Symmetry: C2
């Protein structure tokens, strides 16, 4: 159907360290935003599959953690946690064999 935009997930080396970065790109305006840039991270190849998990108490508490931490940053003002909705995804990251 009609395209709203794109999201990209990158592994990027910067200053010889590896980072994960996510970028949004609007379709109509082509405007880009950095959504995530974290690391250093392990190289790819040691992650499991993304699996959808339930939205029970453990998952709701992950949402509270996210809101508490975002409130420390302040990008979106003072937020009040409501709830985590489906889908929630989990991936295991393994050490190198």
């Amino acid at each position: 159907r009609e395209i709203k935009g794109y999201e990209y997930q990158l592994y990027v080396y910067a200053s010889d360290k590896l980072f994960r970065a996510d970028i949004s790109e609007d379709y109509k305006t082509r405007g880009r935003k950095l959504l995530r840039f974290n690391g250093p991270v392990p190289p790819p190849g040691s992650g499991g599959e993304w699996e959808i998990i339930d939205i029970g108490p453990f998952t709701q508490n992950l949402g509270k953690f996210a809101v508490d931490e975002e409130n420390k940053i302040g990008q979106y003002g003072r937020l009040t946690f409501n709830k985590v909705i489906r889908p929630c995804m989990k991936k295991t990251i393994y050490e190198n064999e």
Copy 2:
């Protein structure tokens, strides 16, 4: 094999607006970090599949954008872009039908 940690991807309502949040959780220490919190975002159900794309010039330029934007933030000091490595993932987000 040996578990290093987990990553979670959430859709979280806060102050009645929908956000995407990513959280890391270390296996041994259980320590958590907020990696991403952006929005407001469209509800789930209108995204395509994540598809691995090539790491040619367009993708390298996404890495430069990410590093330039992270340098404005300063969390990791002044970084020098090196390169984007495989895998690079792209998803299309559609408007509501």
